[PDB]
Design a protein around this ligand. Structure first.
Ligand SMILES: [Mg+2]
Ligand SMILES: [Mg+2]
Ligand SMILES: [Mg+2]
Ligand code: NA
Ligand code: NA
Ligand code: NA
Ligand code: NA
Length: 135
């Protein structure tokens, strides 16, 4: 009966203006960088999906701070973009590379790694930055 695909994405922006990025393992974009992101699974809530994607791709525990945006990528494709804060876990290094990601790392918002999986994350980091400024 499902007719829509919910996706989740996490923006972490530290006090030092660094963003948490993950390095993709998927063949089509292997070695490229992106935000922690993934499709919701049957049985979980959107916040549970956020936490799972962050754990799997970056190794960290987290909590959502706010919903920064909801995007209608298509009539049946919706992406929820959260500002998130780390609450524990261990940052995933390349020692732990697997199918979910090759590693995760923090980069200055203004000095991002390359190549990026997609550039749609630029705007998202700016959203976080503005939110943090407004708050
Ligand atoms: Mg992030
Ligand atoms: Mg860390
Ligand atoms: Mg305001
Ligand atoms: Na939860
Ligand atoms: Na925790
Ligand atoms: Na792009
Ligand atoms: Na993409």
């Amino acid at each position: 009966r499902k007719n829509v695909c919910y996706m989740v994405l996490a923006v972490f922006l530290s006090e030092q203006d660094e963003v948490l990025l993950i390095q993709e393992a998927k063949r089509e974009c292997r070695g490229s960088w992106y935000l922690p992101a993934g499709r919701m699974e049957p049985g979980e809530t959107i916040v549970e999906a956020l936490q799972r994607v962050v754990k799997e791709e970056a190794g960290l525990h987290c909590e959502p701070e706010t919903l920064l945006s909801v995007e209608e990528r298509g009539p049946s494709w919706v992406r929820f973009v959260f500002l998130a804060r780390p609450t524990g876990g261990i940052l995933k290094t390349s020692k732990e590379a697997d199918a979910e990601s090759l590693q995760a790392a923090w980069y200055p918002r203004t000095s991002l790694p390359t190549p990026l999986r997609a550039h749609d994350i630029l705007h998202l980091v700016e959203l976080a930055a503005q939110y943090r400024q407004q708050a």
